[PDB]
């Protein structure tokens, strides 16, 4: 359950920008395969797909811990190990 | 670099994220600046980097010894007390370079 | 009347010629009665000229 | 098992008999089965570039590729002598001849773009054949109409040259993502042809799209291009609905049909069933009715022209030819008529050939030849990318980035051999420009090749003793700017590891180049990518409401393959594995609330479309009906025919 911040100025341009640390829950990668959108309209059903946010997903649910799906990819681990080791 | 700096009164001071911003900024400047060298042995070169330098950080009254590097993710990962206005404590501290 | 057939010149080659729709309504003149079962009579000229202004005020 | 023993090793010595498809990579020896197999498909997958250059690391095999493909290409095999030339358009025109050998007489057709499927295509190189006039000769080997892929001396290259680097763009490369700068996108740019039908009945009219007030043209002329993505748009032409509808035929109606294509036009064919004296009438297909006129104009020069030779006793026509003729004289004879999918239809049918130049974009796909696939994530500025600022090669920029982190596991080394050997040329280049004695620079060239490939340096001295003092200048000018020809052929004379560490420990001054604002001393470097047909205008679908099923449940028309429609409007489904995903949230209410009123239920959809046009547009709270669906409908009128009924308990 995600939200639009942001039109393309371009009508050329026909990519959703998402996000990098999505990837992994989606278990998906920038391989041009075509993700499906159906945007959510109703107050209610937005407060009731809200279990589907990433805030929700955050807590693996395995072991009430933080999931690492949604932590640092590769080359942003890459970046943060260069910085502080 | 500021040899020392107060963990908690940066957490709840109302300047902190200008503080982040300067820190990041001067580490980034100063990466683009300099230029990393390889022995490619087992002897390692001289490379001085912002990240590589120590600073000494006061948390709770106590003194540890960690990278400027260090502070900035440190500061980053601080976040919940900038927002509740909660002092760090010691036990939610780990190995950064981890 | 030419001033609205100048808008409507492109379709005068065939359609019109088989039928002008302008004024085959305006020389209809059928029966009116009001719901108070009165009947009215109007010039066609009158009738003619307002259907023209309204032709043109779309 | 003991079965792959019959493979002996010295049998296939100096041999690429095996190799297939993998001839056109090179340092096939290096790369691993998988990212081979991706290169297969990547070459089916390749789409024509309008800036092609011949590779500058090859296998020599390229050429031979080309040649053997039949579909780039026109060769007259026999001497042929120009008989006459016809013009159906200033774009499309038919030249007749005769072999000077066989005496036999041939035809031969141009046109600006070939259309293979969809809207793929390719432009042409229609020179050679527009310099032939009557009773000029062709030879034996003679290249009539080219593709972009061949160049002058019909060397064949299927993508682009690109300096490339191994380097992360503010996690802009996560995954395989490619940054790539516009200087670099502009050599990256395809052709896309369509060929677009509308179809005209005597119920509709077309709309004065193009021109003015005088002039009413519904459709472009040949050598005018696309306005608003529009091609032609119709109106249904009836009397009670005549009065108000037709008046202002020149603006668009939410009653018409509209036809979206973009790019120019290149040729126009209409097929009418319709009395050609009523078109004279109709001024709405007045442009219709001059094509028309055109086309019975060139089949009547057809025919005036080569009756003498279709129908002299004593003479051989191809067969292509004939039915040329005998079509053109088809469409002038009376009481032709043409049928569309066996059926006579009404009115007219005009078939549209546009062409554009479609460049690179974000999401499109640009992959080496290696397997190396990449999405392209950003198409940035050339000066916000990395630029190196000491040496010789100051102000040089990185035309693409490319991802370092895993292309050791990627198991690929060809790539960084391909990229090594033109960044040491790039030195080599340097040193013979620096030289002023021409034997010095073949000297230096000699030397380099010899180290890569002795065959081509044997080669290339034979070249330049034969060459003319002002040739081998040429040649060795455009060297040294555009660059050197490197062949590293797939399996047999590759550079391997022990050579590359040779020509390194020869040439010390070689070094890592230092970038602006860059720690890390990186290697930029030449490699050949190619374009494929994956896109973000491929399989981009956006449907709010369109055509509803038989059954009242949505469904995919054919709307978008007849150009009717811009995007694709097709639903998609959520799967029995989507309902179970969806099922985590525990609000199953919601859940049928979304699929009856998208889908199941008319009653649910339309108080839902009507919540949403009238009412607060930033605030937006439905009510929704509890009648059944038309779903639950189907499947009770289902069972009763089996004879079972579903009732709660």
Known sequence: YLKIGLIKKDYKD???????????????????????????????????????????????????????????????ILGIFILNN | MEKTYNLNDILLSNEYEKIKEDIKEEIINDMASKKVKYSNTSEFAKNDFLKDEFIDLVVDGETYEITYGNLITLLIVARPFNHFKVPMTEDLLFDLSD | YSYLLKSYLPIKNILDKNNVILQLMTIKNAKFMNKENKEVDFSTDHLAEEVLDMLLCI | MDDISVIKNEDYEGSHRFLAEELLMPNANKTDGNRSTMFCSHLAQAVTLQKAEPPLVYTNFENQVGKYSTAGYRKANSNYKVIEKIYKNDYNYVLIVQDQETGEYTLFERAECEFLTEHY????????????????????????????????????????????????YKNETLEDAIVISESAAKKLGTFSVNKVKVSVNTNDILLNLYGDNENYKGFPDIGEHIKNQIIASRRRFDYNTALYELKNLNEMRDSDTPFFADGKIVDIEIFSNVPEEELKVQKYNEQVLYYINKQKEFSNNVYQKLK?????????????????????????????????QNSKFSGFIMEFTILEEEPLNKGSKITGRYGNKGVISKILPDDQMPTVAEGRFKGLKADICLNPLGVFNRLNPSQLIEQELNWIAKFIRKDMEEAGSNEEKVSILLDFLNRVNKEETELMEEFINSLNKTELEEFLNDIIENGIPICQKPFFGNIGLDELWELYNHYDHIDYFKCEGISTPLIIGEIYMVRLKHEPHSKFSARSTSFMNLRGLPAKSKNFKEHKDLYSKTPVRIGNMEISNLSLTNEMGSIMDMLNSYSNNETNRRELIMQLLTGNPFDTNIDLSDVESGTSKILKSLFTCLGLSIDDV
């Open chain 4, 121 to 168: 295509g390719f432009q042409w190189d229609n020179d050679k054949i527009d310099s032939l006039k009557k009773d000029d000769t062709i030879e034996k080997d003679t290249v009539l109409y080219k593709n972009t892929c061949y160049d002058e001396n019909m060397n064949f290259g299927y993508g682009v040259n690109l300096n490339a680097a191994y380097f992360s």
């Open chain 4, 308 to 340: 003498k030779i279709v129908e002299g006793k004593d003479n051989n026509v191809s067969d292509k030819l004939l039915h040329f003729y005998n079509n053109c004289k088809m469409r002038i004879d009376e009481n032709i008529s043409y049928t569309y």
């Open chain 1, 14 to 76: 026909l990519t959703l920008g998402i996000s990098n640390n999505l990837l992994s829950a989606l278990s998906g990668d920038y391989d041009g395969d075509v993700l499906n959108i159906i945007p959510v309209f109703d107050n209610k059903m937005k407060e009731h797909f809200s279990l589907l946010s990433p805030q929700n997903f955050l807590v693996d649910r395995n072991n009430g811990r933080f999931n690492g799906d949604f932590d640092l990819q590769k080359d942003q």
